[PDB]
């Protein structure tokens, strides 16, 4: 939308980009549509970057006759998930793919059946963080993070939250229905304002230590 203000310095980084170099683990995968989930999904959302994903199944069979050919090792994932399969990242790898209203529009969404890179271990990862309980929250250096499941009950989801959004919380208190990513730390302090249903603040970009 063009630069309407001149600042003294540039932004540290963008969500989905690695910000520090160190030990790292990532695997490829393919995306399943939410409609294919058998017990139906109570929480829905797009396949947006910088959001958690869950394991779905194995698609390495590649055949239908009596002798099958296993020529590759592949896995497929779902946006919400209950079996953690990393966080989507590295936006420079993919393409715009266009948008519904018009192409050439900014978006982090990815179509179903596309291939992405999901990070399990990362020294520094810029992500988009959310807030729970609809109250002002200060994270500071060492809080934990969790992500919304597909099957989150509507009672525990009063604030409309995406399918796989990342939510930070203090050690003592955690929202009732969430899945905690083991051994993850906030690393970068951040403050978030109060929230309301339908008017959730998107939060601010933040560094992450996935493992």
């Amino acid at each position: 939308m063009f630069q309407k203000q001149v600042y003294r310095q540039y932004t540290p980084g963008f969500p989905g980009d690695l910000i520090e170099d160190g030990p790292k683990r990532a695997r490829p995968g393919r995306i399943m549509s939410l409609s294919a989930v058998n017990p139906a999904a109570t929480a829905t959302g797009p396949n947006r970057a910088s959001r958690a994903f869950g394991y779905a199944g194995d698609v390495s069979a590649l055949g239908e006759g009596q002798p099958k050919t296993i020529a590759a090792r592949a896995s497929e994932v779902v946006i919400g998930g209950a079996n953690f399969f990393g966080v989507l990242g590295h936006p420079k790898h993919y393409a715009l793919f266009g948008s519904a209203g018009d192409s050439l529009a900014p978006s982090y969404d990815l179509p179903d059946g596309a291939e992405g890179e999901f990070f399990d271990m990362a020294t520094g990862l810029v992500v988009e963080i959310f807030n729970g309980a609809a109250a002002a929250l200060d994270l500071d250096y060492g809080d934990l993070v969790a992500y919304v499941p597909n099957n989150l009950a509507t009672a525990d989801d009063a604030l409309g939250l995406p399918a796989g959004a990342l939510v930070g919380f203090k050690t003592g208190s955690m929202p009732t229905g969430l899945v905690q990513i083991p051994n993850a730390r906030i690393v970068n302090a951040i403050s978030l304002p109060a929230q309301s249903a339908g008017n959730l603040v998107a939060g601010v970009t933040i560094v992450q230590l996935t493992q």
Binding site: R8, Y10, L18, D21, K92, H93, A95
Partner: protein, 264 residues
């Protein structure tokens, strides 16, 4: 850095009288050095996709590494680094050996006429001439005016007869140099509004005038390096590069040649 400080006095001459002698006494000062770092990483497929839109990914990231380090160095030049915690780095606006800020005669250049603005510069030069007892002549000394970007446009204030502030400055002080900087706009946050600053100082003092072994250098910026390539690490599908720089801040060596105003 060190100081010399000689001493000695004379008496009347005599054939068989005692001979007076001279001596000296030195002192020293210290500062600290700070280092910064910034790097980059590029994958193989990222470059291929970037060339589709006629953009060089590796070169763009390399340029930002140099720019990011320059911003770190530039900020240290104006403000000290961790001066409150205990680090002895300091900067242009934070040096401890400075004459300290003062309130100008005119309350502010805003809502001030031609006479008010011209009076402020005259007082600053008078203090500079009083502080150094006729050692420097402002007429032919090559003095520098710092000023601020929010106040640099007030030099075009004109009288009803067409005479401007800049006309008086050029004729009275032909060797004066005028600059500006955004870092001098918001300085101390007096009540609820930023306070613009004005710094007047001499660029250099002649060796014959003083006798110092070094140059004049009233203000000096201590930079060890501006851009150093640490190394390149090559991996299977990517490579990483590192860069660094070093600086020590600003040092004021002749506090008697500096005049500063706090409020506009």
């Amino acid at each position: 850095q060190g100081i010399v400080e000689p001493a000695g006095t004379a008496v009347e001459y005599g054939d068989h009288t005692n001979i007076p002698l001279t001596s000296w006494n030195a002192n020293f000062e210290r500062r600290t050095i700070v280092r910064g770092e910034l790097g980059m990483m590029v994958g193989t497929l990222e470059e291929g996709r970037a060339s589709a839109i006629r953009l060089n990914s590796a070169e763009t990231k390399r340029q930002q590494a140099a720019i990011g380090l320059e911003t770190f160095r530039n900020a240290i030049g104006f403000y000290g680094w961790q001066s409150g915690l205990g680090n002895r780095t300091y900067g242009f606006l934070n040096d401890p050996n400075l004459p300290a800020f003062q309130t100008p005669p005119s309350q502010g250049w805003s809502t001030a006429d031609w006479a008010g603005i011209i009076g402020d510069i005259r007082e600053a030069v008078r203090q500079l001439r009083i502080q150094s007892q006729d050692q420097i002549d402002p007429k032919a000394e090559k003095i520098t005016l710092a000023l601020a970007t929010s106040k640099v446009d007030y030099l075009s204030v004109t009288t009803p007869y067409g005479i401007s502030v800049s006309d008086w400055i050029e004729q009275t002080y032909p060797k004066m140099r005028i600059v500006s900087a955004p870092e001098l706009s918001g300085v101390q946050m007096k009540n609820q509004e930023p306070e613009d600053a004005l710094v007047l100082f001499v660029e250099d003092v002649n060796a014959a005038v003083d006798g110092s072994t070094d140059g004049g250098s009233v203000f000096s910026q201590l930079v060890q390096s501006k851009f150093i390539t640490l190394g390149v690490e090559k991996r299977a599908k990517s490579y990483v590069e590192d860069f660094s720089n070093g600086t020590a801040g600003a040092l004021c060596k002749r506090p008697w040649a500096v005049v500063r105003y706090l409020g506009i």
